[PDB]
């Protein structure tokens, strides 16, 4: 039940808690080899500087991840990178420093083919989370056979990443590797849900109280109560705005320029396990976990409003009892349950909180239903017949006329051309609808990574983006609006390109833009990198299906003006043909725009061009 869902047993949880306790006594991290498991526990810290960085000028100590170090932690189609707590990130970076021997120990554990486990209590858990992601980006994605799955186990950990963080974990199917135990009242998982200005004065004393290594010499009750109230007020704002933004308020004055009621960007990442005296409740849905983080820490189970802050401090230290009493607790998985009332009542969630958690779960169910309808629509034969007609009928018939379907559509002198236009419009409608669903976060996290969708969208892009470029230049939109690559390319094609590129490139750790610039620099054109990036600004040589676009921007101009761009296009063309991005039966035809333009190029260029064998008869 629990083991079938999380992939860890009670022995591993117990060893993880033992190592997390031991990590207090070791600098940065502690390594423990226990049978078939190797555990990396991280030393937690209770200094204010280790929750909100002193040099961070943002309201929540947040910072955007660097796309080179965490290339998967982003939205593929949109491009937006994930955001994490800067202090936890700096702690991770200080651990992974080559001078710490952490990386060498991790690689030695990888060679042993044992189950590698990153664990931690409090901020250590935070580091553990990041460490796991580090592993996932540096080893597991490169070769999942020699770099095996990690496990991440945290006890009372603060939130680490934002919604894009959790989304990227979900798309890569990495969230299943994370298990975050949270005792019902533990205040630490709720801290970074508050504006750092709301707790800036009371956080040091409460952190000293939360430190398991310190003695409680009966300090200050008032500061603890005020800290709890601040954290709960800001958490309430965040959770209620999540409720309103999920299906109620949409977008009214949500956007920036009005930094009035700033809400924390941090969201639950991975599986969470709430714990009472009698239950273990596992939750996957991040929005549900946020709503529960708010509503389980309320004065509701007995309405003992006066005692709940000290319970919130003591529950950060109650993971020993949690680990000792796991086997005697009743387990249930909230996401897959038919009725969530017993679990949330046992957790003290009010009726309104229960309705909000149910609403979050229902929204995830709606996203799954949307993906199901999308796959049924894209798998029926009446839909695929359009692409099949473009592939097996329109393209060969246009190759027979010796001009290619791009030019045949651009002139549109036959009825087949208008038929192709109709099918292009229908396909565009379907893909624009899917894109609109993606933009509004109304599909599962895994959608953009689904290999069936990637295959279909790549086929559609390769087949139909030439027809959309022909439609763009046929209606002279290049003169009214501008070049196709700058102000005319439909976003659906960008999404399809980015999904395909990420899928095929992520095992090597480089993003498509860096691969492109590496290839153009390997073309050895002999110019400065900034100058080349300026010449290839908004170029069509970054994606094969944009070939014609670049051609349209290069024909008519003198050779000295666009020599760099034409050589770059020619250098990309052969790999494009091999990959299937550009049809070699189309572009070299006698009536093709590209061939008619390529003949006009200087004969000295054609002599040393890689394409002279494809157009011998000029």
């Amino acid at each position, epitope marked *: 039940a629990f083991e079938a869902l999380t992939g860890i047993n009670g022995d591993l949880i117990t060893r993880s808690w033992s190592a997390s*306790k*031991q990590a207090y*006594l070791t600098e940065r991290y502690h390594k423990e080899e226990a049978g078939a498991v190797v555990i990396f526990a991280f030393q937690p810290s209770f200094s204010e500087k280790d929750f909100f960085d002193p040099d961070n000028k943002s309201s929540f100590g947040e910072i955007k991840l660097n796309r080179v170090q965490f290339p998967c932690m982003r939205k593929i189609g949109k491009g937006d990178v994930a955001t994490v707590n800067e202090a936890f990130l700096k702690n991770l970076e200080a651990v992974i420093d080559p001078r710490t021997s952490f990386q060498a120990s991790v690689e030695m554990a990888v060679r042993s083919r044992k189950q590698i486990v990153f664990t931690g209590h409090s901020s250590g858990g935070a580091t553990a989370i990041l460490a796991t992601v580090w592993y996932l980006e540096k080893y597991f994605i490169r070769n999942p056979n020699v770099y095996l799955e990690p496990r991440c186990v945290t006890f009372g950990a603060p939130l680490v990443g934002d919604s894009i963080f959790s989304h990227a974990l979900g798309r890569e199917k990495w969230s299943r590797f994370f298990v975050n135990f949270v005792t019902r009242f533990d205040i630490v998982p709720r801290i970074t849900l508050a504006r750092k200005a709301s707790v800036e004065e009371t956080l040091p004393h409460v952190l000293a109280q939360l430190d398991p290594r310190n*003695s*409680s010499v009966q300090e200050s009750e008032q500061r603890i109560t005020e800290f709890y109230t601040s954290v709960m007020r800001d958490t309430s704002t965040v959770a209620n705005q999540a409720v309103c933004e999920l299906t109620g308020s949409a977008e009214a004055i949500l956007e920036t320029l009005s930094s009035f009621l700033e809400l924390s960007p941090y969201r639950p990442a991975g599986t969470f396990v709430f714990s009472t005296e009698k239950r273990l409740v596992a939750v996957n849905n991040s929005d549900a976990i946020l709503q529960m983080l708010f509503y389980t820490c309320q004065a509701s189970d007995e309405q003992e409003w006066s005692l709940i802050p000290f319970r919130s401090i003591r529950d950060h230290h109650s993971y020993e*009892e949690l680990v*000792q009493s796991m086997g005697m607790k009743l387990f249930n998985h909230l996401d897959g349950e038919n009725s969530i009332e017993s679990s949330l009542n046992d957790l003290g969630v009010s009726t309104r909180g229960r309705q909000y958690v149910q609403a979050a779960l229902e929204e995830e169910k709606k996203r799954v239903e949307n993906q199901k309808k999308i796959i049924q629509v894209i798998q029926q034969e009446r839909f695929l017949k359009k692409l099949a007609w473009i592939e097996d009928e329109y393209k060969p018939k246009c190759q027979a006329h010796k001009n290619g379907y791009y030019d045949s559509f651009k002139v549109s002198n036959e009825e087949n051309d208008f038929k192709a236009n109709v099918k292009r419009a229908e396909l565009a409608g379907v893909f624009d609808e899917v894109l609109g669903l993606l933009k509004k976060c109304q599909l599962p996290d895994e959608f953009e990574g689904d290999i069936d969708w990637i295959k279909l969208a790549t086929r559609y892009r390769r087949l139909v983006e030439p027809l959309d470029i022909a439609n763009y230049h046929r209606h002279l939109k290049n003169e009214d609006t501008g070049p196709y690559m700058k102000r005319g390319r439909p976003t659906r094609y960008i999404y399809a390109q980015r999904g395909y590129e990420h899928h095929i490139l992520k095992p090597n750790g480089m993003i498509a833009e860096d691969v492109f610039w590496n290839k153009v620099n390997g073309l050895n054109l002999g110019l400065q990198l900034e100058e080349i990036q300026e010449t290839l600004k908004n170029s069509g040589s970054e994606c094969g299906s944009c070939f014609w676009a670049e051609v349209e921007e290069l024909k008519g101009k003198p050779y000295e003006e666009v020599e760099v761009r034409v050589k770059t296009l020619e250098g990309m063309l052969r790999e494009w043909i091999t990959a299937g991005e550009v049809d070699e039966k189309e572009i070299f035809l006698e009536g093709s725009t590209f061939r008619k333009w390529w003949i006009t190029l200087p004969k000295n260029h054609k002599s040393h061009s890689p394409l002279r064998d494809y157009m011998m008869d000029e």
Partner: nanobody
Amino acid sequence: QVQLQESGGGLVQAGGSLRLSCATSTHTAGQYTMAWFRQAPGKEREFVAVLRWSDYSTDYANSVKNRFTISRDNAKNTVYLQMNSLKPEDTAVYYCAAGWPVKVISSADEYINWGQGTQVTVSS
């Protein structure tokens, strides 16, 4: 759950010494705060000595400080309380307890695991 078993109690003349042992089922160094408590007939379970998980530091109740000694053999997984200058009022059942994080050493509620206890009777 740590298993704790006390042994070594018995009858001792006033002024004598006696060593009590507490076998633990797992290593407790940097893992559990280990304490000795005692309960006399009718009275309540009061604190005697502590060895902290945090820093390996020892502390004692004022009635036993500088005459009792708490220690641990980490190899044998054993915690000892050596008692000296015993008085008839030290007659009690002695327990060893394990807890975490035990931010209040003298409170019995901080300790999650306990032993069955061993009787110590000091005669006049």
